Symmetry: C2
Subunit: 624 residues, 2 copies
């Protein structure tokens, strides 16, 4: 195995385990020390203000299995430290008949058992498990554990009657899934249900959703309410909160609802961030975020979605969440978004970015799989004075519109997402920052124009504001991770409303994914403006390319160029002319970002292991 990145790549499948550990590896974001990771879990802000982040983890393997909670903490979402205990960086693992098949996703009750932070998680046991299989009751249950040492360790309740698991009965027959309990407080839901509590007897201050669906009949989000305040064993099923149809789609801006939900959460937001009012705040909007499966031809059959909802109270003392409008949380190779409350009226969301090596060709050579997205503040994005002539505006697909009294302008409301300011500040302050002169793209514009300052490695951020004519047919954007022979092109095409990432040339290594990524972006045209603007922020972090547009649209993807000098960046231009010009301003390169794991050495591999011939006998885990 040759690791010469000045010449074409050889046959990299001949390379040893973890020989490509550092080659494509993110440095500026949350990632496990080694091995397999997937969904974020157990997220909470601790008593000292620091952030505890858990994740689905399988150390010393590069496929899923024996799934456990790995964990770390940070005071700023940005620089992290691993927990280190008797099981390394794991803090919860399969150990009991009820969870031996995997400690799946869970969420935090901050004041739980004996006043301690408490996780409610999906405890899995034996049997077929999956939305396309014939799962039975008991295979997925919900269990509690609590921590007396701020997340260094967790103590499970005992196995048995009146103890773990605490939720085991299926609320309906023939479920496609029954997992990912999301526990939350809600003055809103409490006020709505206050007149019906004699019907159900559930009066606790915590609610919990469980994600799933019904065979042949679409996805379901099931709502439970803690039966009694201060008591954590009894959870009363109220009813289905969200009910969608079998592979139902709200349209081109909304993905597809698939057959089964995963990692669903419930929040309430206003323009500033999180809202904890009882309904009295007329600027607040109720949201559900959720993954769907088997409604997509690619991206591992997975859509990470969100919906604004209007709650209705049922006669049986339950809640129907009626979808008002419906969007996409990230359009690329990410999934399993979790959100959690943060002090100062914030709700922060983070997901998992999978690799683009679906045939598992170089996973062993990597010695790891997966990373997080950046941490994102959620809020209600409000755009004022929108022109009624904005194309497609009254479809109200993933936004709402409200006319002015005179009908000459519109207020647009949608879900806002932006990178947490702590990370933006730390990234910029630790980088070599180059503020670039504005560039007018016209008839003289080359297809690709390198920036006047260049990155020095695969760890950088770009900002730019692209001003387009209202009837443009020009395309513009950013090329990143670029040499002569390898590059990744990020294009926006206002005429089609499509933001694309073209990866046909991303790498000389042919085994990685190369499909074109696509997001829809609505440029809301402002009354009196003679142009429309796209504000792009792009993070390049090893192999991760994470794109944010207008504090609204996110697209995470992967690129794995082999050559050491495929690190360049610049402007892309297509169909720009003397008449159809694209004005680029607010241009900035942040070279270096932050070393997110300062205590870790460059290579944190501990080698890879095989479970042996029993893995195929048990049939639960791949075994490697």
């Amino acid at each position: 195995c040759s690791l010469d990145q000045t010449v074409a790549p050889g046959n990299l499948t001949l390379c040893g385990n973890a020989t490509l550990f550092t080659t494509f590896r993110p440095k500026a974001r949350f990632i496990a020390p080694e091995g397999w990771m997937n969904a974020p879990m157990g997220l909470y802000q601790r008593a000292d203000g620091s952030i505890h982040a858990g994740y689905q983890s399988h150390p010393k393997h590069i496929q899923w299995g024996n799934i456990s909670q790995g964990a770390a903490y940070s005071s700023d979402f940005t620089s992290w430290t691993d927990f280190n205990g008797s099981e390394g960086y794991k803090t919860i693992w399969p150990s009991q008949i009820y969870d031996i098949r995997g400690v799946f996703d869970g969420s935090i009750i901050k004041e739980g058992i004996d006043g301690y932070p408490t996780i409610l998680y999906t405890s899995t046991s034996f049997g077929p498990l999956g939305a396309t299989l014939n799962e039975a009751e008991g295979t997925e249950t919900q269990s509690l554990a609590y921590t007396t040492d701020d997340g260094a360790s967790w103590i499970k309740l005992g196995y048995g009657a009146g103890q773990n698991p605490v939720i085991y009965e299926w609320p309906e027959t023939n479920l496609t899934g029954f997992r990912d309990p999301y526990v939350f407080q809600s003055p809103r839901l409490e006020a709505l249900l206050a007149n019906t509590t004699s019907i159900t007897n559930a009066t606790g201050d915590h609610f919990a959703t469980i994600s799933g669906g019904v065979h042949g009949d679409g996805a379901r989000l099931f709502l439970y309410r803690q039966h009694t305040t201060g008591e954590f064993i009894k959870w009363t099923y109220l009813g289905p909160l969200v009910t969608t149809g079998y592979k139902e789609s709200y349209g081109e801006w909304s993905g597809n609802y698939g057959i089964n939900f995963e990692t669903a959460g419930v929040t309430r937001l206003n323009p500033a961030g999180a809202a904890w009012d009882n309904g009295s705040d007329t600027t607040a909007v109720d949201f559900v975020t959720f993954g769907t499966e088997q409604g997509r031809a690619d991206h591992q059959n997975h859509w990470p979605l969100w919906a604004a909802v209007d709650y209705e109270v049922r006669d049986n003392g339950s809640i129907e969440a009626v979808i008002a409008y419906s969007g996409v949380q990230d359009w690329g190779r990410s999934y399993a978004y979790a959100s959690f409350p943060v002090e100062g009226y914030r709700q922060v969301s983070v997901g998992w970015i999978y690799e683009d090596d679906d045939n598992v060709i170089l996973a062993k050579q990597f010695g790891y799989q997966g990373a997080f997205t950046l941490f994102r503040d959620l809020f209600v994005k409000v755009v004022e004075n929108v022109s009624p002539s904005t194309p497609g505006l009254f479809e109200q697909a993933s936004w709402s519109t409200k006319n002015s009294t005179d009908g000459m302008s519109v207020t647009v409301t949608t879900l806002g997402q932006r990178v947490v300011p702590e990370t933006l500040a730390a990234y910029k302050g630790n980088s070599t920052v180059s503020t670039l002169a504005p560039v007018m793209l016209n008839e003289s514009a080359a297809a690709y124009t390198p920036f006047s300052s260049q990155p020095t490695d695969r760890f950088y951020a770009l900002t730019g504001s692209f001003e387009f004519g209202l009837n443009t047919t020009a395309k513009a954007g950013f090329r990143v991770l670029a040499s002569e022979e390898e590059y990744t092109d990020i294009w926006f095409d206002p005429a089609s409303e499509n933001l694309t990432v073209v990866r046909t040339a991303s790498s000389l290594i042919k085994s990685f994914g190369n499909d074109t990524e696509l997001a829809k972006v609505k440029l809301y045209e402002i009354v009196g403006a003679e142009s429309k603007t796209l504000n792009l922020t792009v993070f390049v972090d090893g192999s991760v390319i994470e794109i944010y547009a207008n504090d609204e649209v996110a697209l995470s993807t992967r690129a794995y160029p082999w050559l050491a000098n495929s690190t360049g960046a610049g402007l892309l231009a297509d169909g720009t002319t003397a008449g159809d010009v694209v004005g680029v301003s607010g241009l900035e390169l942040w070279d270096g970002l932050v070393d997110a794991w300062p205590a870790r050495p460059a290579n944190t591999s501990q080698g890879l292991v095989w479970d042996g011939p029993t893995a195929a006998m048990y049939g639960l885990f791949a075994g490697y």
Copy 2:
């Protein structure tokens, strides 16, 4: 619930959990502190000379499940002390995917991993498990753990390739079972295989048998050999050691071989005890002990058997154990005999005595189930100068015969069993001993004649030698646990050769078993004698009645009389006349025996618990 034992029993099913804890409970033998126990396991003599005894254990339940090793130790087989650690008296429990369904029986490698005592045990996982079900490979595997603190705790090898489980591949298809690894050293087997080791490459000093069978085709004992001395991961399958037919029986003296073996062991004995020669000792005999299932209409479908075997070497470098003669280790309500080596050339055997409450009517009220037998020295019983006119002598069913040169006498060889002398000495020395005058049973003999001294409680031993005429039709024996209305009758009937325990009147409580127990006993008649003698030793210990005849025949059973004064004992006589007399001598009562668990209070119940509705969902354990 009334506990008045001076009047007839009420409806005892109304009694609370463990309200009958002390009522019927043995005091003088090995028993768990509370809850369910079954098979002995992990038996070894520790470096300090003390005995470590493990047992299959399910605390705070009265049916089998989550099966674990409970443990205790003793310096004399008789007075015991519990281990106490983080899991109470447990020292190995289900904790890994490979053993989460139960830590089944295992045996000890005294110099194992890093020189420490090491257990090889059956690690069970999910799936149908049983001789009458369709079991698959992986459900039962064999795994290692070792102890650095003389049995207070055990450390399992890791899960994976080249680690646990160490034996997982089925040696043939469609096994009825694959469990109970019995590890042993054998100079005998080493010498037999020494010329064939190039064929298999297995040259280690430890052998292991695994108990099972083949669907439709009878039981099997599979032989493995440690591949390399001092290395414990690799065990090479040689071949089947014992092969028997589907419900094959060697006859009336030999039980039935059923469909599947359990808890099989291999030993070599001579007249003094254990033999460790390479074949050169012409007085030594090779034995296998084993349980069989589904060859019996009652006694939980279970026979605890033994066979003398002659080893033949196969061309493929394996061993066939050809059965020479075949007997019964205990004729009553016991099973799962384990044997282990003890210093001074001894092999000691101990089994499990189950209750006689098969419909589980009063188990919760007991708050426990099960005890051990007494510990027994095994040896080759040799009877010299046997008369050729002994009825049935040349059937050679569960014994061998060798004629003298002149044909006028015979030497009989069989398996000997006797209670370990440490226990006999301790019992006698701690008891109030009454030496009773000989009693001649003739025409004046009543049906029942109380002993001149009586027991004071349900903890005593009786000895007696019964001298019968060679053509007698009289019956005699012992009545125990006797008042006017409740009693248990132990009869021997030389004409039929049957030792019986009649339990039609054992208790006023009708829910307990009342079937007549039966053992065959051959009184080998001595040349020149005008009579034949039965030496009986009987232990009464709470509800256990354990009978030994002529250091050969054992019969364990249960009796649960309600009345406080059902403690008496005496002689039984039937058909004794002036001409057909039974001379009883060597009569002795030992009243009290030994307090076997001096540190335990009278009531060691910790209550009983229910696993809850998930027990039926998982389908592995009853749940209570």
